[PDB]
Design a protein around this nucleic acid. Structure first.
Lengths: 141, 104, 53, 98, 141
RNA sequence: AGCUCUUUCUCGAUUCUGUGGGUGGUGGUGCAUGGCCGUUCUUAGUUGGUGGAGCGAUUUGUCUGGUUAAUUCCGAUAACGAACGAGACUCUGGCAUGCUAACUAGUUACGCGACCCCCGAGCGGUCGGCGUCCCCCAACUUCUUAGAGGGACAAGUGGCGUUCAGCCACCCGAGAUUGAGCAAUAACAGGUCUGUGAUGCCCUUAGAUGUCGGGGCUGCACGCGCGCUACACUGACUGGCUCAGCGUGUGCCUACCCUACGCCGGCAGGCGCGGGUAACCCGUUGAACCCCAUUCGUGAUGGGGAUCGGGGAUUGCAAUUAUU
């Protein structure tokens, strides 16, 4: 069995779990390579962590991710967060602290939230409008 | 003997429910059949929405009442006394209880 | 005896009321409670429907 | 209210033996669950009971469209007479307790 | 390539054509006339399309434990323009999908699965994997 | 409808007929009334004790100033110390590789063989590989769950301000304000008798103003309000990528459920099954926008889907005045 961590990522609705364990190293999402992904325009968003921190690194490790929930963009943000958090969680138990800090540095610097979950979430709609802040219509008389 | 037994409890106000469950759990193992301790089931929110009048002209105002059902089960294996005993204390408010033989 | 005196009552507004008050209008049929809204307002505490938010 | 001389007896006789009666406020089910040597629902039973009450003899409570009928003392004597029955009668009270 | 390896559009595009060459699939004589969904505006521009759906379905089943026509009608089902009313789902035809399911069986790509729903067969599983490779092989680009 | 009538059987003292008297009413009055409710108002409003100030009703407290979402606070002030609304309070939802746990929830990871494909490598045995299925005397609680736990106090720091109350920037990090629910003093001819077996009086009450057959409510030169759908190339289209969440169900106060899956039909739908009091099943809600490979090409055209005609089917005993 081998050195291994689990992590997760969370946007909007749609959590993404990462299992990051020692491997040859080559980075699959649900069950397909991180090279498919599509929405696609976004696709770099999910490459983003790897480039930020040098493509090598992932050579002592196998990476797999599953997302359920949210929707199409929602999912992308979650998986990318799960992957970067993953890599850092892994350097924290197996490698050394200075490396992981170096990585949090590069992410956090340029960032996108990679290691921290955005709070923002639905506000409830209130009777008298079909939205939360939207109020219906009035004519007076 | 030993019989495989399932106790379901469904009811409402929490702190009472929780300490009925506590008690079944603690006396269960305490003299250790060892449970399969309280499986908290997702609490159920019955929702009703109405206009506050009975009867209407008036800012349209809305009221929503809930009724919150809470479920639990606990798994005992034994027999005779500790069955009817462990069910029947554990008794009083506000608490539906069902005990089921086994398999089907 | 009076074959005369009824037409279908199986379904529709006319097939039901308030177990409380006869009213065939504004009837709460959810969860099998079958109370008219005006009544349900007055009995929601004794049924176990409580205000929380 | 209206009715038979047989159905009336069924009502009076059961009432005298039970001491209580219930009928949902419906004039259509024609028949009611429990007793009912069948013939009626509120009506014959409601009307007979309603008449019995107006002259005293029975006290009626409406709540929730059921109408719960409670036999009174003066009424016990009255049904005693209608049934003609054995003095000491002894209807839906007899009793023990504690 | 697992079929999972190839992009959905190219995979389906390649397989659908392969089916066309094979020449033996079978085809409710209609297919000229049919819309494919009540929701549908016009039938399919590629009157040739019967093959594409078949490929799409074969791929669709291979992915998952077992699926049936109702699911497909909905999958194919798009949004239908109520006109005055707001738009709503309308699961797409059941004859086409069924015929597709029956026809595929003839080739053995799929077989009745246990507990309802058609499942891919090992014969099909093998067949899809084989074309999947051919597509991967073609080129880079 | 034996309702009425002819004909002459039937029930059997219930009823009829008379008097006195009830009973219902979706009958009237909310401008006769309870309750409930809107509104002023989620505004910052409200009051007592005790004292001071006045013959007295009363007044100060409860304010020039600053500050606050808020009569929130500070300060000053003949007041001091409190309560009411606001707030605190409760509810919901995010930060917890912490907590205690889970076969009516999942995950890891086996044991994993098999299905088993060869997808690549290998001639193949064999290796790496995505899923389904096996289920197990596997392991777990990370995702999931629901309970208890902690976190925010504008905490530290730096400008500003009576150097105060506060304000602003900055860090950790969920950042001071996530979003509701709870509403006083006192009012209104606000609304409601059609929610009420709440209700007065009134009105009616056998030739009913208490039920069935049938229609209106749905009658169209015209105005108004809430909405919906639109005016297109950020689009309309066809193939194809593809993910969810709050909620819901039958075995029911008296007739009846949610429905996966096979078949037939272009559709609409028809038909045969089988599970499910449900965290088990429908439903990894495989949604839709959207994304995309094509077509169209700026033409009220393929934007738009009105109106009408014919026709298929579903609900119901009955749809004609289209239920759809």
């Amino acid at each position: 069995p081998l050195q291994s961590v689990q992590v997760f990522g969370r946007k909007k609705t749609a959590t993404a779990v990462a299992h990051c364990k020692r491997g040859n190293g080559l980075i699959k999402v649900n069950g397909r390579p991180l090279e498919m992904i599509e929405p696609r325009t976004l696709q770099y968003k999910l490459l983003e962590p790897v480039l930020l921190l040098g493509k090598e690194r992932f050579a002592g490790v196998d990476i797999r991710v599953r997302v359920k929930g949210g929707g199409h963009v929602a999912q992308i943000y979650a998986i990318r967060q799960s992957i970067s958090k993953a890599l850092v969680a892994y350097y924290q138990k197996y490698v050394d602290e200075a490396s992981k800090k170096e990585i949090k540095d590069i992410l956090i610097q340029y960032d996108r939230t990679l290691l921290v979950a955005d709070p923002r979430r639905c506000e409830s709609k209130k009777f008298g409008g079909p939205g939360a802040r939207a109020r219906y219509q009035k004519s007076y008389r | 003997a030993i019989h495989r037994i399932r106790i379901t409890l469904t009811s409402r106000n929490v702190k009472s429910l929780e300490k009925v469950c506590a008690d079944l759990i603690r006396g269960a193992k305490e003299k250790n059949l060892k449970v399969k301790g309280p499986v908290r089931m997702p609490t159920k929110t019955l929702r009703i929405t109405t206009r506050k009048t009975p009867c209407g002209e008036g800012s349209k105002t809305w009221d929503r009442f809930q009724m919150r059902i809470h479920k639990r089960l606990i798994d005992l294996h034994s027999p005779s006394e500790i069955v009817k005993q462990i069910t029947s204390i554990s008794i009083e408010p506000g608490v539906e209880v069902e005990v089921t033989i086994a398999d089907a | 005896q009076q074959l005369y005196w009824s037409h279908p009552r199986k379904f529709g507004q006319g097939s039901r009321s308030c177990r409380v008050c006869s009213n065939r209008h504004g009837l709460i049929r959810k969860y099998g409670l079958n109370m008219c809204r005006q009544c349900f307002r007055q009995y929601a505490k004794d049924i176990g429907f409580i205000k929380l938010d | 209210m209206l009715m038979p001389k047989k159905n009336r007896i069924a009502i009076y006789e059961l009432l005298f033996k039970e001491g209580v009666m219930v009928a949902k406020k419906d004039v259509h089910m024609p028949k009611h669950p429990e007793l009912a040597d069948k013939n009626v629902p509120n009506l014959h039973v409601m009307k007979a009971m309603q008449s019995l009450k107006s002259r005293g003899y029975v006290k009626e409570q409406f709540a929730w469209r059921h109408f719960y009928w409670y036999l009174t003392n003066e009424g016990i004597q009255y049904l005693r007479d209608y049934l003609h029955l054995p003095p000491e009668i002894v209807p839906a009270t007899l009793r023990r307790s504690r | 390539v697992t079929v999972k390896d190839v992009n959905q559009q190219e995979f389906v595009r390649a397989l659908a054509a392969f089916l066309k060459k094979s020449g033996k699939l079978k085809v409710p004589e209609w297919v000229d006339t049919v819309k494919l969904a009540k929701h549908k505006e016009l039938a399919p521009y590629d009157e040739n399309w019967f093959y594409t759906r078949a490929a799409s379905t074969a791929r669709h089943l291979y992915l998952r434990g077992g699926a049936g026509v109702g699911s497909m009608t909905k999958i194919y089902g798009g949004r239908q323009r109520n006109g005055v009313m707001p738009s709503h789902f309308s699961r797409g035809s059941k004859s086409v999908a069924r015929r597709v399911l029956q026809a595929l069986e003839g080739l053995k790509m799929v077989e009745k699965d246990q507990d309802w729903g058609r499942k891919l067969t090992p014969q099909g599983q093998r067949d899809l994997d084989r074309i999947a490779g051919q597509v991967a092989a073609a080129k880079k680009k």
